[PDB]
Design a protein around this ligand. Sequence first.
Ligand SMILES: Cc1cc2nc3c(=O)[nH]c(=O)nc-3n(C[C@H](O)[C@H](O)[C@H](O)COP(=O)(O)OP(=O)(O)OC[C@H]3O[C@@H](n4cnc5c(N)ncnc54)[C@H](O)[C@@H]3O)c2cc1C
Ligand SMILES: CCOc1cc2oc(=O)n(CCC(=O)O)c2cc1Cl
Ligand SMILES: CCOc1cc2oc(=O)n(CCC(=O)O)c2cc1Cl
Ligand SMILES: CCOc1cc2oc(=O)n(CCC(=O)O)c2cc1Cl
Ligand SMILES: [Cl-]
Length: 448
Amino acid sequence: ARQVTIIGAGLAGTLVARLLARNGWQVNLFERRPDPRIETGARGRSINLALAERGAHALRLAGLEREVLAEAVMMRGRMVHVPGTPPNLQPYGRDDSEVIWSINRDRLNRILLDGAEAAGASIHFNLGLDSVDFARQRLTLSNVSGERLEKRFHLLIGADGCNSAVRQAMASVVDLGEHLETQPHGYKELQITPEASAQFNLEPNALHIWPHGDYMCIALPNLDRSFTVTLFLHHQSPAAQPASPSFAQLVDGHAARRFFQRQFPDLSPMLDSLEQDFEHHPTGKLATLRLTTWHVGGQAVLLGDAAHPMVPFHGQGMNCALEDAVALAEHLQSAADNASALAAFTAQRQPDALAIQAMALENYVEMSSSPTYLLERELGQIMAQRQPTRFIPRYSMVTFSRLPYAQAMARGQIQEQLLKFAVANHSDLTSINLDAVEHEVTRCLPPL
Ligand SMILES: Cc1cc2nc3c(=O)[nH]c(=O)nc-3n(C[C@H](O)[C@H](O)[C@H](O)COP(=O)(O)OP(=O)(O)OC[C@H]3O[C@@H](n4cnc5c(N)ncnc54)[C@H](O)[C@@H]3O)c2cc1C
Ligand SMILES: CCOc1cc2oc(=O)n(CCC(=O)O)c2cc1Cl
Ligand SMILES: CCOc1cc2oc(=O)n(CCC(=O)O)c2cc1Cl
Ligand SMILES: CCOc1cc2oc(=O)n(CCC(=O)O)c2cc1Cl
Ligand SMILES: [Cl-]
């Protein structure tokens, strides 16, 4: 039986642990945190993620989709909130088969842990990887107190997140060609209780957006009708705009309240614990990190956030990590040896990770910033109706299909260009020749 050591019992790590263990690999999974399935008296908080077709299909292959969806809230569309006008629902797809799912991250992680164990993987909690000795094939782990434990390894999988200790250890034996692109927005999580969301008629089956240009709020629903609100706002005000809003300007919860009352007036009354949430929840950091190399021979490989940290504006990080887990398990199971498997996995996934990193950055402007956008979406829906095998909106290709991200981006660019060309030199949708637009669709978009 082939052996594997996995670092990080997160989303990618647990899924790959289940896929390999059920194929008869001897799997040992090391996690820095305590086991979340061990109930304590700690007062934790609900953070949700949007599960889309790539993540759902990965869970489906693993036999866990039904269990995960049983506690997921359907999000049919984008509910855009602008003060003065009623909230506008922009459906994501053609029917209720084309939806995204709001899932509690802790619940998903617990289902995945149970799944990896049921398949035969051994999970070891309260052990954080500190260092790897590649030449001696040993690694060093420790608990929070720094008590060390050394282990031998044969194959090392770094599924240890955006601040990966496996990636740090690899970067010492090989130049990973790491390129970091910091993102100016920080993020803060705030809560809407079930009573408040019901009082203010906040739609549970939608992903909510309060656009505001350089900053915005989003809200994802929970099963109990509470919502997690995420504020995206610059850490610091730029030199050109010193008066522009930023986290640096919000000294306390009371300052955050004044900011919401002024900039998000329809949202502030729903946030009862705004002051406390603001002061007690830390401001998170965002970034895009691109690596030239994801593996060291046949000894170690990275996947998920460990391999490709991305900005969260497409809700695709977990979806991409679960898709990586499937690809990695497939390559490892069927290759001639581990070195061939790692080289083939990296060659396959690197162009796709780059495409989703680029599309995630582009989706920020789409969410936070229009009459022309709605006219291009209008013409795009007509083109999707006339040619459903050639014209598939980029959001639908990313979210509802398993088309490689790089192909979704490439086809998306052709579509963006033709929509922009047709909506140019025309005031209304009635002056645009639809048959002419349909002709460049047939000329430049091959069918799928
Ligand atoms: C604000 C925000 C919103 C998001 N929303 C979405 C969304 O809607 N949809 C979506 O698809 N994605 C979303 N994402 C992205 C998603 O959360 C991640 O891409 C995903 O969790 C990556 O899974 P992972 O398994 O690679 O890493 P993680 O889930 O981060 O798991 C890594 C694991 O490794 C452990 N670990 C870390 N260091 C060590 C160590 N040294 N030793 C041992 N264990 C270690 C951690 O404790 C953790 O359990 C969001 C991210 C953010 C920040
Ligand atoms: C067995 C591993 O379990 C987990 C790993 C995790 O990694 C994370 O970033 N979070 C989410 C953020 C946080 O709740 O602090 C998280 C939660 C769980 Cl249950
Ligand atoms: C904290 C959760 O954050 C997110 C989740 C998400 O899921 C998605 O599908 N998107 C895009 C939605 C759209 O463009 O309407 C998305 C964006 C963000 Cl910031
Ligand atoms: C990317 C290229 O896109 C196009 C090329 C085009 O050439 C044309 O003659 N038409 C129609 C002219 C018009 O009625 O505006 C046309 C339309 C589109 Cl979308
Ligand atoms: Cl994301």
